[PDB]
Amino acid sequence: GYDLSASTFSPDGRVFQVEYAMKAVENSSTAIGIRCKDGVVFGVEKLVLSKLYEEGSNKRLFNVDRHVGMAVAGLLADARSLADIAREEASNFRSNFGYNIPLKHLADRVAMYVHAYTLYSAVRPFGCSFMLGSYSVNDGAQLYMIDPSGVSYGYWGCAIGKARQAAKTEIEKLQMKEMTCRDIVKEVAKIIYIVHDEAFELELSWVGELTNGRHEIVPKDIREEAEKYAKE
Amino acid sequence: RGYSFSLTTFSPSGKLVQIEYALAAVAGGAPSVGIKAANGVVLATEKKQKSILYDERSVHKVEPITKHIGLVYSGMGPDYRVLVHRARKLAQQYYLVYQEPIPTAQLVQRVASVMQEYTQSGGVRPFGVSLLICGWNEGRPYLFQSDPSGAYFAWKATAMGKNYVNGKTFLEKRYNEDLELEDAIHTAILTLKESFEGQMTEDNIEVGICNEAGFRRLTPTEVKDYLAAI
Amino acid sequence: SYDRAITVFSPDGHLFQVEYAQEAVKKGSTAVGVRGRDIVVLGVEKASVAKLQDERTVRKICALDDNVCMAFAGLTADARIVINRARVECQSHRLTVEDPVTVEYITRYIASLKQRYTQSNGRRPFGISALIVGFDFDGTPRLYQTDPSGTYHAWKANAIGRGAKSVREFLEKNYTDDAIETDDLTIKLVIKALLEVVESGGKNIELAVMRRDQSLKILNPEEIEKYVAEIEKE
Amino acid sequence: NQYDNDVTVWSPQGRIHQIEYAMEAVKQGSATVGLKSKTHAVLVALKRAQSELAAHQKKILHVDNHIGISIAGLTADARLLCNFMRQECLDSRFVFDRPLPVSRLVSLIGSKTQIPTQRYGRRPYGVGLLIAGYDDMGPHIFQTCPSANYFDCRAMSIGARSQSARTYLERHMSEFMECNLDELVKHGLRALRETLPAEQDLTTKNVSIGIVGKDLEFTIYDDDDVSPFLDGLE
Amino acid sequence: SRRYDSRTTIFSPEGRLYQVEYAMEAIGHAGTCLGILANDGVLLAAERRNIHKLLDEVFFSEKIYKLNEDMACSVAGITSDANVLTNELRLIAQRYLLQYQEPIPCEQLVTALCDIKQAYTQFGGKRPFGVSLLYIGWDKHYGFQLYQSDPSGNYGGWKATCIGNNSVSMLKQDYKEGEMTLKSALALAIKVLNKTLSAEKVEIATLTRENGKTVIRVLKQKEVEQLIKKHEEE
Amino acid sequence: DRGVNTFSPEGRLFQVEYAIEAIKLGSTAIGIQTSEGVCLAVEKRITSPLMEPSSIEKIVEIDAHIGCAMSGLIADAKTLIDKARVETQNHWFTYNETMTVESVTQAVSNLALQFGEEDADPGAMSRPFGVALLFGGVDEKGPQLFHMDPSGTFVQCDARAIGSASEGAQSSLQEVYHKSMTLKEAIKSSLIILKQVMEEKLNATNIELATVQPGQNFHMFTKEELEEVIKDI
Amino acid sequence: TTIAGVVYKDGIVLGADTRATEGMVVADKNCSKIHFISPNIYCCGAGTAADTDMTTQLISSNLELHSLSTGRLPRVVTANRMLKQMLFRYQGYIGAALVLGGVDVTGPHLYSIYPHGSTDKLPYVTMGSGSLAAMAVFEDKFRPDMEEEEAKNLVSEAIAAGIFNDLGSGSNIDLCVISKNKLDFLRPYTVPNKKGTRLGRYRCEKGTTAVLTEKITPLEI
Amino acid sequence: MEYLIGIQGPDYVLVASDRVAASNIVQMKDDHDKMFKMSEKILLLCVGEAGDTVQFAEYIQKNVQLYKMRNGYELSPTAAANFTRRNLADCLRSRTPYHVNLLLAGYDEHEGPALYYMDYLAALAKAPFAAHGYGAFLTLSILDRYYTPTISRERAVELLRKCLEELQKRFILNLPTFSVRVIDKDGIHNLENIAF
Amino acid sequence: GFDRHITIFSPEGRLYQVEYAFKAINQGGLTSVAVRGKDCAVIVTQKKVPDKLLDSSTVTHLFKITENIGCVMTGMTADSRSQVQRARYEAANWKYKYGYEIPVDMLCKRIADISQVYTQNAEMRPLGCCMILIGIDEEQGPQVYKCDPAGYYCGFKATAAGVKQTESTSFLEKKVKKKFEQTVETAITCLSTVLSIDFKPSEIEVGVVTVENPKFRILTEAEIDAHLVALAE
């Protein structure tokens, strides 16, 4: 019984309370994020249970600091918790150092927060993978993705969730570097409609030159324009 | 945060299970000899690394406690370094309140006092380092050994680490009460020479003496000197 | 800082730590007391203290301040803490209201204390049981018997030691009105009650009496012998 | 089952293994139903009488100044959570001097009941709130859960066999965003009148409802005031 | 975690304390050092560890520890713990002086140490102090007196009790309780230690006086070679 | 074992559904709210006859117009009876009026399901209070009695039985009460104690009865009043 | 208190007068004001006579704990920064206008520590009241990059110029010379102030006493 | 501004307080007795601030009373005097200075009678006779002129009447009655109060 | 009992958590070999991007402690950045607390010591990453150190870290007994002779320090490409 406590290793060095949290986001829906030269476009799959839930019953594209975003995957309680303390973290940076928070420091900070939270038997690990993303006027379209292990990598087209085994292939075959984000908002629906293999009432948000370092649910028109990527 | 329950506890036989395991982890440690001599001591130890790859001037095993008191270990690696940190701090509390270098006996009182509460007090395991103490303290030199239990005894000679029964019997054979300077170093060298696992390299041993002028490590040109005079 | 909940409800409403303290008072001395209507009286069959004891420090009989005094039964070292805190708060209740402190109030403090150790985080509720005797402002020689569950009862014999279920059924049988006199029939009833259990009072029994808010007097084994002889003569 | 020392542990598939079991612990609770119109949202609760007779453990609660709730699970833990929600709703009356919006209310209790899910040896708040209030825009209604995962829903039913009330209430969403108070609460009571064990009546005793919305305080209708809501035969 | 704690402060189902009577068996492994009082002063009589040459000089031994001008203590069991507690109780002695300008009558000291050692077996979840140390002392109130305590917490006046292995029953057939004449107490001490021997492997220490102030002697070497030839038969 | 803050494979807490037990253990108490008062009674189950029966406090007056009636694990209630009376005189202190019964019952039942192993400072509770009780009290609304649980659940009650006789006495009390006091609810409630009888024919030594009537404040009955009632049955 | 210290090509030369005057009367006519911290760092002291003592026992003990933690010889910058940060957070309640100097692996240099916690790298410093009596003799005859012997003569002339016209004067000058290889802590350098002499013996033998009650107590046996 | 007096005899020590409880301009009930009963043979007295006399010295009475009825025997008056000097001396500078000045009459069995004295700063000293208040300033020379180191009991009482009649004659406060207690080897015995 | 659960002593010593933490640093395995030059402590490691979807600039090990100390770690990369941030914290805390910039040795002593107090107390796991960290002080030459997850820093010439540690230190031991500022036949060739890839200049990260320029420099594909085409002898 080398299980059930994050302060106990395996006999081959593998802390099982972390990889049990990793499959705990693999049983939740996808949320893809695609970088391009004018900013980062998010898109989240929704798995609307009943008709009783209205539009945006649970936000899964949170925002934090008026420019970085929160496409989350796993338990929405834990993801919402680290979302609001990310809000408090960029609050302490902007209040403390004045300068608006560069995203690499926020991803390293929230990353070591959720990592240092997996060293104790007096806490459980988080059960929520999530990703960030923004750009300053001289930053580049920085996005990062953070596991429940606490590791944070810079990506281009990272995808977390249940069907990330499917979702990583189309983002890899999509032309990554040089297109101007509006088309890829449209193209995000092609990824979401491919990976949904079963109400899929999806939701998108981005940051871009049409936004100047902000976040909007889409505005609302591509929801009746990227809906026209049915039959593909 | 924390546990606040002792993991060291009493067996149904009526003994401490963790402390005998600590003396097992000491007994699986590197062998180290210490010889009390009529004016001064010698505390030799054995630094066998994995390969001929490391800096043998980087880490020490002879290292002083701030005035004239060196202490050498046998067992766990870094728990020793914690005991050097605590021991230097306790010697400097004593030095800032009483304005003399600490008597060796009182330093062994306080080091054995700090090693006791790690046999208690909240989830901490005991150290498993039975380091031994030297010191000139006025008139006649001292020598001690703080076990990972917390006991301490003073004597004329000892060994510890691997095969220490041969060290205690061999030092019981070759000891004289007036045997005082470099002859002690001689028998210390031929106590480590007894096993050593081979060839007696000067970079793999280091000694430390307390020759009435402060504890001082011996330079590697001096041990090889007497290794030429074997 | 140890915070494990020890005294917890098991199934079928059984609070096992407290009943384990009930065997812990079942495995002690044999204390006994009698409310004798003008006097109160104790007794605890002691062991072999004559071989090499000191009789001054074998006391199952203590004194709280002057009138109230108690005979613990069980574990004999967790009791002394309750003695000390009883004496401390008893002096505090001499500080506020300034009375010859009533026996009801101090035994409510003891029962409330042990009940506060059936609640706190990890501290093993006591294995003692008391005989809080004494008086008040107007005679009334009230006796009280506490419990490791913190339940005090104002009963009149309460033999609560180790072989004392026989003593309390004996005292159920043989205490109606014959012990309403000054001291002799009451103390005769106590030494008869403990001579039911063991042997002679020249090595075993010791007693204590208390008369009308003065003179808490113990009985040295020369004086106990006279009463024992009378009982033997019967 | 080594996953019994268990709001720290994970079942090897994905499961946290007891804060979904707190969701079982609000499936066990009594049934209720809330819903919303385009103008004013309503709450309807049936109250279990596990006694002689009672106020039947009054469910829907006054928290607020138009943000009313409907508990369904533990009652003491529910009252603790609505003293929290109540106290900081009044704190937002104190500081900002505006009505506290319903979304930030349910989100920060969604961060308050989320802490014992995280840490060690602390059970989750085993209560399923069904909160409902009228902020600046339309009258919201939020199921929240002991898994600290609220839902911006419309027309939700939680409690014992409340799934049948949902499947009535799912296929009758078309006549919402109209359907004023007199014909709305009838449409909610005939949604509640399926969780009952198939024998005939939503009595005035057990049904307590609450109304909140445009130009009216969150208003509780108890034993008497539910009697003007009367219709339906099935 | 609650899977990891040794749970020291738990009553047995037989009512006793598991970690306490394991300390009582720790005394029987290593322990000697009886103590005899007389009409004159009191002595300890002790044993060192083994025959192992390799031992230069003890100022006082590892057994007899000085506490005041008029008290001393000897130690059984685990020697690592008791060192700590004897420095601890030494602090107690001096602060009584700071509070009272008295030389601390020794029963106060034994009561204080037994209260804190009882506090380590009461709560905190730690292991108890595995030492049944004992005390000799004098006050102006009582005579020469020795007390004896154990890791459980209780104590007593134990006029000739030894601790450790091979248990004192011969002393309770040989000690004259009235008069003892401390030279013959030395003779009885080397009798008992002669059954259970120069100062290489013995450590005897006396407490006497001259003109009011007490004198604690550790009985330097050649006195032991006197008493070891004070036999022929025994 | 497992801890105190864990949920059971039935659906509820361990320590709460274990705290429903040790209420079957202990004495039985009953109470009847009427239209002109509320009567409480308890057969306090004296063990030996060698003794004094009039100091087993199971009818305890919180205030002059609130009297409680506990059972189960006795003397575990004294901390929350202490909180009941301290909260009562705090209410009268800060607000200069009487109370309800749902404010003292609101205040005590918050302390029931408030425990835990690793929490704030060790003056907190480990086990839940294994004592079920009910506050007989008169208000400006009406006389009423509020039956608590160890779970913190408290309910309006007009005829409630606790203790070991929580099934047979409750079912007997279910069919014998509808109307009002008119002096005979206190004589048709010790009749339920007369059916309950464990050791002795319910004389004025083993039952404690007390009524709370809107004219007076309370009345803990003395011996000759009790045996005046017992003579009438 | 008149104090001073001068850096030169090999090292530094500290120096102080030896007199401590509480109120307006000398309590003690010979006290060291040149305190040990380290075999390469000596400080000095002025202001409160006890606060300099305790702050340099604390930084001496903590510093040589630091140096035997590192193993190498301790630098003089870390003594400056520990005196600065530890002397600052008591808000200047400690009155310790001390200077400190050292030869180390970078170069021989000295600092001054004002009692509020303001530090100055200087070639030459003067704390105490005798600052004013010993700063001008660093302004007519001080030269940079000067040899050890006339630097010793310079600091002795400075402290000796703090003797003769200041009321915080001293009995005699002691001064330390900290070089690269050797340390020279020499107690008194010059004694320009003899005691003088007495004239005429005073006492009888076993007289001139009003004895009321004797009491004799032996010690050994 | 009250008055406490004591005289150490060879086998006794007698104390006397002024039996006046004052106010701003008037005096309250006379009796209010200032001498606080300690265990059996100790007896301390307290004047000074109106509100620390009844508070501090009663707390000392609690601790010494707890010592006797906790550990059998009572304190010697030396340990009680150094006890209350410790408690006043460490309650002095911290947060609330107890402004009381104590006498402490007492005797142990196997040593002489002792009359301890302390100011409001808790500096303790033995004395064969001590005084307090403003009335100390004029009456103390009469205990200088007539006090032999060995004095009988009735001579000390009539000497104490000399001191109180002088205190009646010159001292400006109306102190008409004085409470007198002789303590000696049979326990605390109190003589009839002196009046005028 | 709990020998393989808690950081406590088993029988025969050998506390079973640090070698369970040593096996944690071999997870995946991106492998550093550090080369020391009598005037230049070069750094080498291998780094594999999975899928050409990671940002290759962001993934690294190669952290910078200060302007004179670099580091590289081969453990589980979750536990890496929690360890390097505390090393930056103690470096800047040393420069604020003791004046001069921290020399490389007792930095590794200090992070070895907090890793010790991880493996001394219970209720925390000893985090599985070892810190190959280089740096130059004024007195001695360039140094290199590695504290393990047990806290045993040594003072090395040329160890390695990660998967294939033994083959690497065998190759370095066989190729140091011969006698190197260029380090062209030592630094990369340990990797290309252990695991046989003969790298293009993408997957290798190199961090040098020189005595002539003690600032820690991470190299790019231009200069490491000239460094790789210099393997044509």
- For residues G169 and G159, give the distance between their C-alpha atoms in angstroms, rounded to a whole number: 9
Chains G and F touch (3+ CB pairs under 8 A): no
Indicate yes or no: CB of C52 within 8 angstroms of CB of E7. Answer: no
Number of domains within chain G = 1
Resolution of the experimental model, in Å, one decimal = 3.8
Chain C residues closer than 8 Å to E147 by CB? 57
Neighbouring residues of D164: CB distance < 8 A, sequence distance ≥ 6 = D194, D195
Q: Annotate chain H with DSSP letters as a single string.
A: ---EEEEE-SSEEEEEEE---B-SSSB--S-----EE-SSS-EEEEEESTTTHHHHHHHHHHHHHHHHHHHSS---HHHHHHHHHHHHHHTTSSS----EEEEEEEE-SSS-EEEEEE-TT--EEE-SEEE-STTHHHHTTHHHHS--SS--HHHHHHHHHHHHHHHHHT-SS----EEEEEEETTEEE-PPPB--
Chain B residues closer than 8 Å to G61 by CB? 92, 95-96
Q: In angstroms, what separates the C-alpha of C2 from chain B's closest C-alpha?
A: 5
- For residues A222 and A188, give the distance between their C-alpha atoms in angstroms, rounded to a whole number: 11
Closest to A20 (Cβ–Cβ): which among D10, D114, D120? Answer: D10
**Residues found in chain G:** 221
Closest to H62 (Cβ–Cβ): which among C63, C66, C91? Answer: C91
* DSSP 3-state of D155: coil
- Residues belonging to chain D with any Cβ–Cβ distance to chain E shorter than 8 Å: 5, 120-121
C32 and C43 Cβ atoms separated by less than 8 Å: yes
H169 and H138 Cβ atoms separated by less than 8 Å: no
Per residue, what are the HEC states of chain G? CEEEEEECCCCEEEEEECCEEECCEEEECCCCCCCECCCCEEECCCECHHHHHHHHHHHHHHHHHHHHHHCCCCCCHHHHHHHHHHHHCCCCCCCECEEEEECCCCCCEEEEECCCCCEEEECEECCECCHHHHHHHHCCCCCCCCCHHHHHHHHHHHHHHHHCCCCCCCCCEEEEEECCCCEEEEEEEECCCCCCCCCCCCCCCCCCCCCCCCCCCCCCC
Q: Show which of residues 55-94 on chain I sit within 8 Å of chain A, judged by CB atoms.
A: 55, 57-59, 76-79, 81-82, 85
Closest to B96 (Cβ–Cβ): which among G58, G69, G71? Answer: G58
Indicate yes or no: CB of H65 within 8 angstroms of CB of C94. Answer: yes
Whether D14 and chain A come into contact, CB under 8 Å, resolves to yes
- For residues F52 and D137, give the distance between their C-alpha atoms in angstroms, rounded to a whole number: 70
* Sheet-wide strand order for I69-73: I63-64, I69-73, I131-136, I142-147
CA-closest candidate to residue G37, choices G61, G7, G17, G65: G61
Chain C residues closer than 8 Å to B2 by CB? 1
CA-closest candidate to residue C15, choices E44, F72, I93: F72
I104 and I135 Cβ atoms separated by less than 8 Å: yes
Mutate to test the interface with E, among B5, B16, B165 (most CBs of E within 10 A): B5
- For residues A155 and E152, give the distance between their C-alpha atoms in angstroms, rounded to a whole number: 64
For E26, the enclosing helix (H) or strand (E) is helix E18-29
Q: First CA to last CA across chain C, in angstroms?
A: 59
Token pair in block for residue I117: 């107090």
CA-closest candidate to residue I128, choices I113, I160, I150, I152: I150
Nearest chain B residue to C2 by CA: give it.
B4
If you search the block for the tokens 């021991």, which residue do you land on? B87
**Burial per residue of E22-57, b for 16 or more beta-carbon CB atoms within 10 angstroms, e otherwise:** bbbbbbbebbbbbbbbbebbbbbbbbbeeeeeeebe
* DSSP 3-state of C35: strand
Beta bridge partners of I134: I70, I144
Which residue ranges form the domains of chain D, and what is each CATH number? 1-234 (3.60.20.10)
Size of interface G-I (CB pairs under 8 A): 22
Chain G residues closer than 8 Å to I99 by CB? 75, 77-78, 80-81
E63 and E203 Cβ atoms separated by less than 8 Å: yes
Per-residue CA distances from F107 to D79, E175, F136, I41 (Å): 11, 66, 15, 71
Evaluated on CA atoms D112, D114, D120, D124, the torsion sign reads positive
Evaluated on CA atoms F203, F207, F208, F213, the torsion sign reads negative
Domain H1-196 homologous superfamily, CATH? Aminohydrolase, N-terminal nucleophile (Ntn) domain (3.60.20.10)
Closest to A77 (Cβ–Cβ): which among D149, D152, D154? Answer: D149
- For residues C43 and H158, give the distance between their C-alpha atoms in angstroms, rounded to a whole number: 53
Which ranges constitute the DSSP H helices of C60-174?
A: 79-96, 103-116, 165-173
| C30 phi, psi to nearest 5 deg | -130, 85
Whether E2 and chain D come into contact, CB under 8 Å, resolves to yes
Q: Annotate E77-142 with DSSP letters as a single string.
A: S-HHHHHHHHHHHHHHHHHHHHHHSS---HHHHHHHHHHHHHHHHHSSSPPP-----EEEEE-SSS
Neighbouring residues of F106: CB distance < 8 A, sequence distance ≥ 6 = D79, F154
- For residues F127 and F132, give the distance between their C-alpha atoms in angstroms, rounded to a whole number: 14
Q: Is A213 left (phi over 0), alpha (psi -120 to 50) or beta?
A: left
If you search the block for the tokens 């007492």, which residue do you land on? H106
Token pair in block for residue G40: 């390469």
- For residues I114 and I124, give the distance between their C-alpha atoms in angstroms, rounded to a whole number: 12
Among the listed residues G1, G18, G52, G56, the single catalytic one is: G1
Active site residue G70: no
Neighbouring residues of H191: CB distance < 8 A, sequence distance ≥ 6 = H14, H157, H180, H181, H182
| G197 phi, psi to nearest 5 deg | -150, 160
Per-residue CA distances from H56 to C93, F160, H75 (Å): 16, 54, 18
Task: Write out the CATH class of domain F1-233.
Answer: alpha beta
Per residue, what are the HEC states of B114-126? HCCHHHCCCCCCC
CA-closest candidate to residue G16, choices G29, G30, G4, G31: G4
Per-residue CA distances from G138 to A40, D217, E197, G41 (Å): 68, 87, 78, 22
- For residues D136 and D154, give the distance between their C-alpha atoms in angstroms, rounded to a whole number: 17
Chain B residues closer than 8 Å to I109 by CB? 81
CATH number at residue G19: 3.60.20.10
Which amino acid is located at E23 in the chain? Answer: A
- For residues G160 and F23, give the distance between their C-alpha atoms in angstroms, rounded to a whole number: 94
Domain region containing G16: 1-221
DSSP β-ladder status, E65-66 and E43-46: unpaired
Mutate to test the interface with E, among B6, B111, B138, B175 (most CBs of E within 10 A): B6
Q: In angstroms, what separates the C-alpha of I135 from chain B's closest C-alpha?
A: 14
If you search the block for the tokens 């990260």, which residue do you land on? I205
If you search the block for the tokens 């038969």, which residue do you land on? E233
Chain B residues closer than 8 Å to E127 by CB? 6, 8-10, 119-120
Chain H residues closer than 8 Å to E100 by CB? 75, 79, 82-83
- For residues A103 and A109, give the distance between their C-alpha atoms in angstroms, rounded to a whole number: 10
If you search the block for the tokens 């560890």, which residue do you land on? E49
DSSP β-ladder status, A152-154 and A159-160: unpaired
- For residues C42 and C31, give the distance between their C-alpha atoms in angstroms, rounded to a whole number: 7
Which residue ranges form the domains of chain I, and what is each CATH number? 1-233 (3.60.20.10)
- For residues A23 and F220, give the distance between their C-alpha atoms in angstroms, rounded to a whole number: 65
Whether B53 and chain I come into contact, CB under 8 Å, resolves to yes
Chain E residues closer than 8 Å to H71 by CB? 107-108, 111
Residue A83 CB-density burial (10 A; 0-12 exposed, 13-18 middle, 19+ buried): buried
Mutate to test the interface with B, among E87, E90, E127, E152 (most CBs of B within 10 A): E127
Q: In angstroms, what separates the C-alpha of E207 from chain F's closest C-alpha?
A: 46
Token pair in block for residue G29: 């006519």
User: Which chains form contacts with chain E, at 3 or more CB pairs under 8 Å?
Assistant: B, C, D, F, H, I
What is the Rg, in whole angstroms, of the alpha carbon atoms belonging to chain E? Answer: 18
* DSSP 3-state of E10: coil
Mutate to test the interface with F, among D123, D127, D205 (most CBs of F within 10 A): D123
- For residues A55 and F45, give the distance between their C-alpha atoms in angstroms, rounded to a whole number: 64
Which residue ranges form the domains of chain A, and what is each CATH number? 1-232 (3.60.20.10)
Chain E residues closer than 8 Å to H78 by CB? 101-102
- For residues E29 and B16, give the distance between their C-alpha atoms in angstroms, rounded to a whole number: 12
CA-closest candidate to residue I152, choices B53, B79, B50, A11: B79
| I200 phi, psi to nearest 5 deg | -75, 160
I78 and A150 Cβ atoms separated by less than 8 Å: yes
Token pair in block for residue B90: 């306790």
**Residues found in chain C:** 234
Which amino acid is located at E67 in the chain? Answer: L
User: Which chains form contacts with chain G, at 3 or more CB pairs under 8 Å?
Assistant: B, I
Nearest chain D residue to F175 by CA: give it.
D52
CATH number at residue B139: 3.60.20.10
Neighbouring residues of C137: CB distance < 8 A, sequence distance ≥ 6 = C99, C100, C102
Evaluated on CA atoms H26, H30, H32, H33, the torsion sign reads positive
Which residue ranges form the domains of chain C, and what is each CATH number? 1-234 (3.60.20.10)
B79 and B128 Cβ atoms separated by less than 8 Å: yes
If you search the block for the tokens 């002129």, which residue do you land on? H145
Residue G153 CB-density burial (10 A; 0-12 exposed, 13-18 middle, 19+ buried): middle
| B97 phi, psi to nearest 5 deg | -95, -35
| Structure determination technique employed | cryo-EM
Token pair in block for residue E70: 């008029």
Mutate to test the interface with C, among F126, F162, F205 (most CBs of C within 10 A): F126
CA-closest candidate to residue F42, choices F181, F211, F214, F158: F211
Beta bridge partners of E147: E135, E157
Whether A84 and chain D come into contact, CB under 8 Å, resolves to yes
Beta bridge partners of E145: E137
Q: Show which of residues 112-171 on chain F sit within 8 Å of chain E, judged by CB atoms.
A: 117
Q: What is the DSSP letter of E65?
A: E
DSSP β-ladder status, C214-218 and G98-102: unpaired
Token pair in block for residue B176: 């004289």
Q: Is E7 left (phi over 0), alpha (psi -120 to 50) or beta?
A: left
Token pair in block for residue A91: 């609050």
Token pair in block for residue G126: 């003067």
Chain B residues closer than 8 Å to E19 by CB? 9-10
Indicate yes or no: CB of C57 within 8 angstroms of CB of E10. Answer: no
* Cβ atoms within 10 Å of F34's Cβ, excluding its own: 22
Which amino acid is located at F199 in the chain? Answer: E
CA-closest candidate to residue E147, choices E91, E108, E96: E108
Indicate yes or no: CB of C3 within 8 angstroms of CB of B4. Answer: yes
Size of interface C-H (CB pairs under 8 A): 21
Tell me which architecture the domain covering E1-234 has in CATH: 4-Layer Sandwich (3.60)
